[PDB]
Short mmCIF file of C-alpha atoms in Angstrom, two decimals:
data_model
loop_
_atom_site.label_atom_id
_atom_site.label_comp_id
_atom_site.label_asym_id
_atom_site.label_seq_id
_atom_site.Cartn_x
_atom_site.Cartn_y
_atom_site.Cartn_z
CA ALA A 2 157.16 154.39 55.53
CA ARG A 3 159.47 155.82 52.87
CA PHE A 4 158.67 159.36 51.30
CA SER A 5 160.25 160.33 48.04
CA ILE A 6 159.90 163.15 45.50
CA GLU A 7 163.23 162.11 44.15
CA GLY A 8 164.16 163.54 40.71
CA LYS A 9 160.83 165.33 40.41
CA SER A 10 162.62 168.52 39.58
CA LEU A 11 160.54 170.79 41.61
CA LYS A 12 161.40 174.50 41.92
CA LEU A 13 159.92 174.79 45.41
CA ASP A 14 160.30 178.43 46.81
CA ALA A 15 157.30 177.52 48.90
CA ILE A 16 154.63 174.81 49.45
CA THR A 17 151.29 175.62 47.47
CA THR A 18 147.79 174.47 48.30
CA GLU A 19 147.37 171.59 45.93
CA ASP A 20 151.15 171.24 45.92
CA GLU A 21 150.63 170.45 49.65
CA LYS A 22 147.50 168.33 48.80
CA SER A 23 148.91 166.47 45.82
CA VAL A 24 152.60 166.22 46.56
CA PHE A 25 153.43 166.02 50.30
CA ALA A 26 150.09 164.65 51.35
CA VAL A 27 151.90 161.50 52.62
CA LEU A 28 154.62 163.55 54.31
CA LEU A 29 151.83 165.79 55.81
CA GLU A 30 149.60 162.86 56.96
CA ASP A 31 151.85 160.04 57.89
CA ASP A 32 153.80 160.09 61.19
CA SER A 33 155.58 156.75 60.94
CA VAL A 34 157.53 158.09 57.92
CA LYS A 35 160.96 156.51 58.39
CA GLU A 36 162.78 157.84 55.15
CA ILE A 37 162.52 161.10 53.22
CA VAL A 38 164.10 161.62 49.82
CA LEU A 39 164.15 165.16 48.56
CA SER A 40 167.07 164.79 46.16
CA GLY A 41 166.79 166.26 42.67
CA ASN A 42 164.66 169.34 43.43
CA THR A 43 165.35 173.07 44.35
CA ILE A 44 164.22 173.92 47.85
CA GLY A 45 163.65 177.60 48.57
CA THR A 46 163.39 179.14 51.96
CA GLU A 47 159.68 179.02 52.46
CA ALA A 48 159.31 175.51 51.23
CA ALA A 49 162.00 174.55 53.66
CA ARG A 50 160.07 176.13 56.48
CA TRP A 51 157.04 174.06 55.64
CA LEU A 52 158.97 170.87 55.37
CA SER A 53 160.66 171.52 58.66
CA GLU A 54 157.50 171.57 60.60
CA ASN A 55 156.37 168.45 58.84
CA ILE A 56 159.73 166.60 59.54
CA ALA A 57 160.24 167.32 63.18
CA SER A 58 156.97 165.40 63.76
CA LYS A 59 158.46 162.35 62.28
CA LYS A 60 159.85 160.94 65.63
CA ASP A 61 160.75 157.68 63.67
CA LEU A 62 162.70 159.26 60.97
CA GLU A 63 166.00 157.55 60.48
CA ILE A 64 167.19 158.46 57.00
CA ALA A 65 167.34 161.91 55.44
CA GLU A 66 168.47 161.89 51.91
CA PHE A 67 168.75 165.46 51.22
CA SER A 68 171.55 165.46 48.56
CA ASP A 69 171.01 167.78 45.60
CA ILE A 70 168.31 170.06 46.80
CA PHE A 71 169.68 173.58 46.14
CA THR A 72 170.76 173.54 42.37
CA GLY A 73 169.96 176.96 40.92
CA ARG A 74 169.82 178.82 44.39
CA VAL A 75 172.13 181.70 45.15
CA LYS A 76 174.87 180.16 47.28
CA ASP A 77 174.68 182.69 49.94
CA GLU A 78 170.80 182.35 50.21
CA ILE A 79 170.72 178.67 50.99
CA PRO A 80 171.66 179.10 54.62
CA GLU A 81 168.07 179.93 55.77
CA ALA A 82 166.60 176.80 54.25
CA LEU A 83 169.52 174.62 55.34
CA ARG A 84 169.26 175.86 59.04
CA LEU A 85 165.52 175.29 58.87
CA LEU A 86 165.97 171.63 57.75
CA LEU A 87 168.94 170.66 59.88
CA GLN A 88 167.27 172.08 63.00
CA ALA A 89 164.15 170.02 62.32
CA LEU A 90 166.36 166.98 61.91
CA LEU A 91 168.13 167.49 65.21
CA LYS A 92 164.65 166.68 66.68
CA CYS A 93 164.50 163.25 65.03
CA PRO A 94 166.10 160.81 67.67
CA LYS A 95 166.29 157.77 65.47
CA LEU A 96 167.75 159.69 62.50
CA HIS A 97 171.06 157.70 61.98
CA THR A 98 171.84 158.49 58.35
CA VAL A 99 172.00 162.02 56.86
CA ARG A 100 173.12 162.74 53.18
CA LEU A 101 173.84 166.26 52.13
CA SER A 102 176.01 165.74 49.12
CA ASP A 103 175.97 167.63 45.81
CA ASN A 104 174.94 170.84 47.56
CA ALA A 105 177.18 173.90 47.38
CA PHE A 106 177.85 175.12 51.00
CA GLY A 107 179.66 178.45 51.11
CA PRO A 108 181.13 179.66 54.53
CA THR A 109 177.79 181.02 55.53
CA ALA A 110 175.69 177.77 54.85
CA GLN A 111 178.54 176.07 56.99
CA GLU A 112 177.18 177.44 60.37
CA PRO A 113 174.07 175.45 60.59
CA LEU A 114 175.91 172.52 59.15
CA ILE A 115 178.46 172.73 61.84
CA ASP A 116 176.00 173.17 64.78
CA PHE A 117 173.92 170.18 63.55
CA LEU A 118 176.96 167.95 62.85
CA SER A 119 178.23 168.73 66.26
CA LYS A 120 174.92 168.20 68.05
CA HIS A 121 173.18 165.25 66.33
CA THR A 122 174.28 162.20 68.59
CA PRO A 123 172.23 159.74 66.85
CA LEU A 124 174.05 160.17 63.56
CA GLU A 125 175.85 157.06 62.42
CA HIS A 126 176.22 157.49 58.64
CA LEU A 127 177.10 160.78 57.16
CA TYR A 128 177.36 161.64 53.48
CA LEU A 129 178.87 165.05 52.56
CA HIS A 130 180.29 164.67 49.00
CA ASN A 131 180.91 167.35 46.46
CA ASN A 132 179.90 170.57 48.42
CA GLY A 133 182.84 172.59 47.33
CA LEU A 134 184.00 172.83 51.01
CA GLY A 135 187.76 173.21 50.56
CA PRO A 136 190.57 173.07 53.23
CA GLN A 137 189.12 175.87 55.48
CA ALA A 138 185.71 174.52 55.65
CA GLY A 139 186.86 171.02 55.55
CA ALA A 140 188.54 171.51 58.97
CA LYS A 141 185.38 173.03 60.26
CA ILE A 142 183.52 169.76 59.52
CA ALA A 143 186.17 167.90 61.17
CA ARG A 144 186.18 170.05 64.25
CA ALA A 145 182.52 169.86 64.61
CA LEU A 146 182.42 166.13 64.19
CA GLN A 147 184.97 166.14 67.09
CA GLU A 148 182.31 167.80 69.24
CA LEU A 149 179.98 165.14 68.13
CA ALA A 150 182.11 162.43 69.80
CA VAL A 151 182.11 164.35 73.09
CA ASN A 152 178.22 164.72 73.02
CA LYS A 153 177.80 161.19 71.87
CA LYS A 154 180.03 160.03 74.61
CA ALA A 155 178.18 161.80 77.49
CA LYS A 156 174.95 160.57 76.19
CA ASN A 157 175.82 157.02 75.50
CA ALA A 158 174.57 157.44 71.93
CA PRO A 159 175.45 154.96 69.18
CA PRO A 160 178.83 155.41 67.55
CA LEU A 161 179.53 157.08 64.18
CA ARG A 162 179.94 154.34 61.64
CA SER A 163 180.24 155.91 58.21
CA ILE A 164 181.92 159.08 56.80
CA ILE A 165 181.59 159.82 53.15
CA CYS A 166 183.41 163.10 52.41
CA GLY A 167 185.07 163.43 49.00
CA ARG A 168 185.24 165.73 46.14
CA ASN A 169 185.30 168.68 48.57
CA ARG A 170 188.94 169.89 48.27
CA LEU A 171 189.82 168.98 51.76
CA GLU A 172 193.53 168.61 50.72
CA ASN A 173 196.41 168.87 53.06
CA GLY A 174 195.23 171.93 54.84
CA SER A 175 192.56 170.23 56.99
CA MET A 176 194.34 166.91 57.61
CA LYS A 177 195.52 167.58 61.04
CA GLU A 178 191.78 168.22 61.90
CA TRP A 179 190.51 165.03 60.30
CA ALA A 180 193.26 163.02 61.99
CA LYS A 181 191.69 164.39 65.28
CA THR A 182 188.20 163.57 63.95
CA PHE A 183 189.18 159.98 63.44
CA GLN A 184 190.84 159.81 66.87
CA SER A 185 187.47 160.84 68.21
CA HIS A 186 185.68 158.21 66.32
CA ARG A 187 187.62 155.03 66.64
CA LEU A 188 184.56 152.69 66.01
CA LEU A 189 184.28 153.83 62.42
CA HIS A 190 183.43 151.08 59.81
CA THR A 191 183.51 152.96 56.61
CA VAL A 192 185.63 155.95 55.60
CA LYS A 193 185.63 157.60 52.06
CA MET A 194 187.54 160.89 51.29
CA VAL A 195 188.00 160.50 47.62
CA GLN A 196 189.10 163.19 45.14
CA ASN A 197 189.99 165.85 47.65
CA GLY A 198 193.32 166.86 46.27
CA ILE A 199 195.02 165.49 49.40
CA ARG A 200 198.76 165.17 48.84
CA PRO A 201 201.59 163.14 50.13
CA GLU A 202 202.18 164.74 53.34
CA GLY A 203 198.45 164.94 54.15
CA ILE A 204 197.96 161.31 53.28
CA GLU A 205 200.79 160.31 55.57
CA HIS A 206 199.51 162.36 58.51
CA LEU A 207 195.92 161.32 57.99
CA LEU A 208 196.81 157.63 57.81
CA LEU A 209 199.24 157.49 60.79
CA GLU A 210 197.85 160.10 62.98
CA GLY A 211 194.14 159.35 62.30
CA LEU A 212 192.85 156.25 60.50
CA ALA A 213 195.45 154.15 62.25
CA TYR A 214 193.48 154.46 65.46
CA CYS A 215 190.35 153.24 63.79
CA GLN A 216 190.56 149.44 64.46
CA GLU A 217 186.98 148.55 63.28
CA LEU A 218 187.73 149.85 59.89
CA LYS A 219 186.22 147.60 57.17
CA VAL A 220 186.09 149.90 54.16
CA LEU A 221 188.56 152.67 53.33
CA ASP A 222 188.65 154.56 50.01
CA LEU A 223 191.18 157.35 49.29
CA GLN A 224 190.68 157.09 45.59
CA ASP A 225 192.31 159.96 43.52
CA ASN A 226 194.57 161.60 46.03
CA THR A 227 198.34 161.85 45.84
CA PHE A 228 200.26 159.18 47.69
CA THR A 229 203.70 158.79 46.23
CA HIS A 230 206.20 156.78 48.19
CA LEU A 231 205.54 158.75 51.25
CA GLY A 232 201.78 158.30 51.57
CA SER A 233 202.44 154.69 50.59
CA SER A 234 205.01 153.93 53.32
CA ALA A 235 202.43 155.44 55.71
CA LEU A 236 199.84 152.99 54.49
CA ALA A 237 202.32 150.14 54.76
CA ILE A 238 202.42 150.92 58.42
CA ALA A 239 198.76 151.66 59.07
CA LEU A 240 197.56 148.34 57.48
CA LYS A 241 198.43 146.24 60.68
CA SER A 242 195.92 148.44 62.51
CA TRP A 243 192.86 147.22 60.53
CA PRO A 244 192.53 143.49 61.15
CA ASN A 245 188.84 143.77 59.88
CA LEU A 246 189.74 145.51 56.65
CA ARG A 247 187.50 144.19 53.82
CA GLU A 248 187.75 146.91 51.06
CA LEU A 249 190.90 149.04 50.40
CA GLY A 250 190.28 151.65 47.65
CA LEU A 251 193.45 153.12 46.13
CA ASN A 252 192.54 153.85 42.59
CA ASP A 253 194.54 156.75 40.86
CA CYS A 254 196.54 157.39 44.12
CA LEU A 255 199.88 157.37 42.36
CA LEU A 256 201.41 155.15 45.04
CA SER A 257 204.43 154.85 42.83
CA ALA A 258 206.43 151.71 41.98
CA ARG A 259 208.35 151.45 45.22
CA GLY A 260 205.32 152.86 47.00
CA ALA A 261 203.34 149.72 45.85
CA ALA A 262 206.21 147.46 46.68
CA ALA A 263 206.08 148.74 50.31
CA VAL A 264 202.33 148.29 50.42
CA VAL A 265 202.46 144.69 49.05
CA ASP A 266 205.34 143.85 51.49
CA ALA A 267 203.08 145.07 54.33
CA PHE A 268 200.33 142.74 53.35
CA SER A 269 202.69 139.82 53.06
CA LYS A 270 203.26 140.44 56.82
CA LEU A 271 199.75 140.27 57.87
CA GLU A 272 198.06 137.06 58.97
CA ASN A 273 194.40 136.24 58.64
CA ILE A 274 193.47 138.90 55.85
CA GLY A 275 189.83 139.03 55.47
CA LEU A 276 190.18 141.50 52.61
CA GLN A 277 187.68 141.05 49.72
CA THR A 278 188.35 144.16 47.57
CA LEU A 279 191.58 145.61 46.61
CA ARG A 280 191.74 148.54 44.14
CA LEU A 281 195.19 149.55 42.74
CA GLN A 282 194.28 151.14 39.46
CA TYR A 283 196.68 153.63 37.89
CA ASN A 284 199.42 153.56 40.56
CA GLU A 285 202.67 153.33 38.44
CA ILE A 286 202.94 149.74 39.73
CA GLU A 287 205.40 147.56 37.96
CA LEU A 288 205.66 143.82 37.40
CA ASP A 289 207.90 142.84 40.30
CA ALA A 290 205.37 143.99 43.08
CA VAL A 291 202.50 142.24 41.05
CA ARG A 292 204.60 139.06 41.22
CA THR A 293 204.94 139.49 44.91
CA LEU A 294 201.28 140.48 45.16
CA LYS A 295 200.52 137.37 43.08
CA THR A 296 202.07 135.21 45.82
CA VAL A 297 200.51 137.18 48.77
CA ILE A 298 196.99 136.96 47.30
CA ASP A 299 197.49 133.12 46.82
CA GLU A 300 198.94 132.53 50.27
CA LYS A 301 197.75 135.33 52.41
CA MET A 302 194.46 136.60 51.05
CA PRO A 303 191.85 133.63 50.95
CA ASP A 304 188.71 135.91 50.87
CA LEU A 305 189.71 138.17 47.95
CA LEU A 306 186.96 138.64 45.48
CA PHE A 307 188.04 141.87 43.47
CA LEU A 308 191.30 142.99 42.20
CA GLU A 309 192.05 146.14 40.17
CA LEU A 310 195.26 146.56 38.39
CA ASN A 311 194.28 148.27 35.12
CA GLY A 312 196.35 151.40 34.19
CA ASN A 313 199.60 150.21 35.82
CA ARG A 314 203.10 149.78 34.50
CA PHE A 315 203.16 146.12 33.38
CA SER A 316 201.42 144.32 30.60
CA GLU A 317 198.29 142.21 30.62
CA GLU A 318 200.44 139.59 28.70
CA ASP A 319 202.96 139.13 31.55
CA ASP A 320 202.91 135.60 32.93
CA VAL A 321 201.96 136.88 36.52
CA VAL A 322 198.58 137.85 35.13
CA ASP A 323 197.60 134.30 34.05
CA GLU A 324 199.00 133.03 37.38
CA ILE A 325 196.70 135.32 39.19
CA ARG A 326 193.73 134.30 37.11
CA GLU A 327 194.59 130.83 37.95
CA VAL A 328 194.57 131.38 41.62
CA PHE A 329 190.97 132.37 41.17
CA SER A 330 190.11 129.59 38.82
CA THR A 331 191.43 127.04 41.19
CA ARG A 332 189.64 128.56 44.08
CA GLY A 333 186.47 129.18 42.02
CA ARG A 334 186.23 132.59 43.75
CA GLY A 335 187.69 136.02 42.86
CA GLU A 336 188.32 138.00 39.84
CA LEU A 337 190.90 140.33 38.09
CA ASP A 338 189.73 143.40 36.27
CA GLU A 339 190.21 143.99 32.54
CA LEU A 340 193.92 145.27 31.79
CA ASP A 341 193.08 147.16 28.60
CA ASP A 342 194.89 150.38 29.51
CA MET A 343 198.25 149.57 30.78
CA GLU A 344 201.36 151.87 30.64
#
């Protein structure tokens, strides 16, 4: 059973009488509830206390979509409801996916968040995007998630599979911590830390000291973070570590021209590339690497389906473009994006 009040825009400081008889009747009557969507409403303290008691009873709850549930609330008054909700979830043994994005978590709201994240061993997919964390709080999430690995390990719990944490200003200052968090979770399948303001030295460290140890990695998205030649050379080295890589997201990462050359040259050296999606939008990439890429895709990437090169430093009119297009045509599979905004 799936319960949703999504986008109902409810200013719930508490749970009324008919609001309890006409809104959360299913959540208050059904026990086999497997999903709960509270996204798009404002949850006050009292309401949170109500839901908590009606959520801890759902022993088969697996998905908790609680993104966007505190808009309008005073940042430092959210901790009580958060704690009440997260502590109720720690009682749901089959809860594998938790989403808490689009929620402003100040340093205070971070305590119950940290305790929960460090204790919920059944967690497999976490979504924590756009919470205004920052470097300080970012390392706290990292650190807590490292405690999760230990608890999971002692309890034989399933491994963490997804980690979506972007648009949270993690930047360079919390990268030594995440590297450690990825060392703790080497069975990860999806990782997305887009738009965090991470810079060259943080990208390099994160890739080589962290992600590189994640061999089951299928999807990696480091969209909108500064790579430069440094970060790029660090990727060129990490690549060989992900034999199961399917999607590599690198849009707006300013890999640089030589950066991109180094990255393309790394791929050329990998055999059996099961890669399907390659995003290289706005990376200051120039013609020469695209020509090299052209060959690499044709000879070394038989499963490619999506290629993004818009915004780079070569023109759609260069002959390599029609060459690429022809690789797809002949194969009958794969597509290039529209190059309408080149440099």
